[PDB]
Write a protein that holds these residues in place. Structure first.
Motif, PDB file in Angstrom:
ATOM      1  N   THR B  17       0.857  -1.181   0.000  1.00  0.00           N
ATOM      2  CA  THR B  17       0.000   0.000   0.000  1.00  0.00           C
ATOM      3  C   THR B  17       0.894   1.232   0.000  1.00  0.00           C
ATOM      4  O   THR B  17       1.315   1.694   1.064  1.00  0.00           O
ATOM      5  N   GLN B  18       1.182   1.759  -1.185  1.00  0.00           N
ATOM      6  CA  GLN B  18       1.961   2.985  -1.279  1.00  0.00           C
ATOM      7  C   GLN B  18       1.124   4.155  -0.789  1.00  0.00           C
ATOM      8  O   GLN B  18       0.023   4.398  -1.290  1.00  0.00           O
ATOM      9  N   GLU B  19       1.647   4.874   0.200  1.00  0.00           N
ATOM     10  CA  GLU B  19       0.853   5.821   0.967  1.00  0.00           C
ATOM     11  C   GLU B  19       1.388   7.244   0.830  1.00  0.00           C
ATOM     12  O   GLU B  19       0.837   8.174   1.426  1.00  0.00           O
ATOM     13  N   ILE B  20       2.416   7.442   0.014  1.00  0.00           N
ATOM     14  CA  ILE B  20       3.012   8.743  -0.223  1.00  0.00           C
ATOM     15  C   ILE B  20       2.232   9.429  -1.344  1.00  0.00           C
ATOM     16  O   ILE B  20       1.521   8.787  -2.121  1.00  0.00           O
ATOM     17  N   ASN B  21       2.328  10.756  -1.408  1.00  0.00           N
ATOM     18  CA  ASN B  21       1.626  11.565  -2.407  1.00  0.00           C
ATOM     19  C   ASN B  21       2.648  12.157  -3.376  1.00  0.00           C
ATOM     20  O   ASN B  21       3.236  13.207  -3.117  1.00  0.00           O
TER      21      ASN B  21
END
Lengths: 49, 49
Positions: B17-21
């Motif tokens: 789950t890539q959670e960076i913007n």
């Protein structure tokens, strides 16, 4: 107030003049040879008899 | 003394789950161009007549 006093552009021309002197005369006639060794050895004969 | 207690293996699941913007929104609509030159120069017209 000229309408193209700041849009006119400065362009050179193909006129490169070779000014420096980089010649090689005495190198050009020494009859080059490929010596792939450490040091050149030959024999010089003096007198004595 | 359980038969398989230390011989368990920890296996992660396929749930990254890539959670960076990392959003490039304004860059995505600017109509990209190349420029193999030093600097862009253009003309802007004023009044005077």
């Amino acid at each position: 107030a000229k309408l193209n006093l700041a849009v006119l552009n400065n362009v050179f021309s193909e006129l490169l003049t070779q000014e420096i002197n980089r010649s090689a005369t005495f190198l050009g006639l020494l009859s080059k040879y490929p010596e792939r060794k450490s040091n050149i050895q030959w024999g010089v004969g003096m007198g004595g008899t």
